[PDB]
Amino acid sequence: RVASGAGLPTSRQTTIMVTKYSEKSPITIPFELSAACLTYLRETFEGTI
């Protein structure tokens, strides 16, 4: 606000609420892994270098 005006009072209390709108968007990609290689993780080998 500019209060310099002697005869001019602002009509508003300067608390103007403003609504906006959200926009959701999917984020999806194909992915893959080898279960035949995963079985080495499943079986916890330790017997040979």
Added chain:
Amino acid sequence: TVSAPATYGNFVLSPENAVTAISYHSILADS
């Protein structure tokens, strides 16, 4: 009598029973 190999090899891990153990992994859904 004739001697035969016991373990199938050194590189493979025990048990010698092999397939009988892995079947339990499916149903659940010294060296």
